[PDB]
């Protein structure tokens, strides 16, 4: 239902949803922020703000288009959403302003203005966005000195040393033909998109992207950026999860869905079916937490990110949630895995099917760039409902029993103890 056809150059992937209005045509590349050096890092976010600049967005919005882009840890995307009658116009704009000549984008005007803007918004992200920066610090301390350790926004010390030669070399090195998928979602049919792709000669380059030497290997480490002037104590810890296109991928997402999310202030979230909420609600040990399960091209994380105003009982929160983690290996029952199966089906149907045709385009581009053909939602629900409790017990024995964890924190985390107690907490003496 979400078809994919490979031409002589590019590969096109679309899903015709004839109920939505705004059709959306873009191109998604398969080399995000884990395909560059630590010395030119931050050139992908800079490319995103080149494409979303004022002049390019004005000469896009005069036509009736709306630009959107997304930089992740393995794919970067460039989406031109538009009206359903206006799709060859959007494809011709994406041809004339990204695939061919980019000299009107890479001026001494546009590049300096957008570099000042990127430096400002990146230092604001470093100063006043605390859970996302400790998630990025967890990524920088888990896969350290291997190229999954780069921040996807870049950092200011590796961003004030960039000129247009590095951006042009990154364009020649990663905006290739064997690196891109042209996505389509909204109410375009497949033959309309591929005929408008076949009419105008739309191909970027010929070669292949450079393979890179280091594999993303997990290293159990610890970092703490303690700021004792902050009100809370954000701290995230995670183990090595499954990568994408691994057979234990849905089991990892299901085990993350077992402990789910929590927010202490909504009254409908203090009543969930999690066993942890009967431990962390007598002294208000945390204000919110959520168990992510990220899966990149080479490796991935699996763990929870919390935030705490009770800055003295941090160790009790870590202790209770790691005992609940060991409960997956020893004594997870069947009613929690059925609850997590239903909630994971709800969450994947919410994520894969929204009214937004840019999240659908980015998901289709990522999972077509990795696998080659995006799997369905009925077959994904079958793969969810074919999971036992011995399967998640075997996965928890493989990846959660006495493994090495990576910890990142900020705020007032002196109440957090040292590393070896938290690492000795990942496996208990059977009670």
């Amino acid at each position: 239902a979400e078809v994919t056809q490979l031409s002589n150059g590019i590969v096109v992937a679309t899903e015709h949803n004839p109920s939505a209005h705004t059709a959306s045509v873009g191109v998604v590349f398969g080399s995000g922020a884990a395909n560059e050096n630590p010395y030119n890092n931050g050139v992908s976010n800079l490319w995103k703000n080149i494409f979303l600049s004022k002049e390019n967005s004005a000469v896009a919005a005069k036509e009736g288009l709306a630009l959107s882009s997304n930089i992740s840890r393995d794919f970067q995307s460039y989406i031109v959403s538009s009206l359903p009658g206006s799709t060859d116009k959007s494809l011709d704009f994406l041809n004339q302003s990204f695939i061919q000549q980019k000299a009107n984008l890479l001026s001494s005007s546009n590049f300096e203005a957008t570099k000042k803007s990127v430096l400002k918004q990146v230092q604001d992200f470093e100063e006043n966005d605390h859970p996302n920066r400790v998630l990025e610090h967890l990524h920088s301390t888990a896969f350290q000195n291997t190229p999954l350790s780069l921040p996807t926004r870049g950092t200011l010390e590796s961003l004030e040393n960039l000129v247009v030669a590095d951006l042009e070399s990154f364009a020649n090195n990663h905006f290739l033909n064997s690196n891109a998928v042209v996505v389509g979602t909204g109410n375009i049919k497949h033959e309309d998109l591929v005929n408008s792709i076949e009419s105008k000669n739309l191909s970027l380059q010929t070669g292949t992207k450079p393979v890179l030497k280091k594999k993303a290997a997990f290293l159990g480490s610890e970092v703490r950026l303690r700021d004792d002037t902050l009100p809370k104590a954000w701290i995230s810890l995670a183990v090595e999860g499954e990568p994408v296109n691994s057979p234990n991928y849905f089991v990892a997402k299901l085990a993350a869905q077992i402990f789910g999310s929590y927010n202490a202030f909504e009254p409908a979230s203090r009543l969930q079916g999690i066993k942890l909420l009967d431990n962390i609600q007598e002294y208000q040990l945390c204000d919110n937490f959520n168990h992510f399960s990220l899966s990149y091209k080479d490796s991935g994380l699996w763990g929870f990110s919390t935030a705490t105003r009770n800055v003295t009982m941090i160790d009790d929160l870590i202790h209770f949630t790691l005992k609940q983690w060991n409960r997956l290996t020893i004594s997870v029952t069947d009613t929690e895995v059925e609850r997590a199966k239903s909630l994971l089906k709800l969450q994947l149907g919410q994520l894969y099917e929204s009214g937004n045709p840019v999240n659908d385009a980015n998901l289709l581009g990522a999972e077509v760039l990795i696998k080659g053909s995006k799997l369905s939602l009925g077959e994904a629900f079958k793969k969810i409902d074919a999971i036992t409790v011995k399967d998640v017990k075997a996965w928890a024995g493989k990846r959660l029993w006495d493994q090495d964890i990576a910890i990142a924190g900020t705020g007032q985390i002196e109440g957090l103890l040292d590393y070896m107690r938290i690492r000795s907490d990942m496996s208990m003496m059977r009670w």
Partner: protein
Amino acid sequence: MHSYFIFKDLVTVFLFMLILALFVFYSPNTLGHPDNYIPGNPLVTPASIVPEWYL
């Protein structure tokens, strides 16, 4: 204290047990005076009344 200084203390506890086991098993009376093994007779003075070595 738990996972670090307990093991530091355990290192020096096993070292002290090694030295104490040496001094107990291989040379016990090299610390005490060789006149405490004569039964106490309050008519003979042993010509120097040194106490135990730490006093």
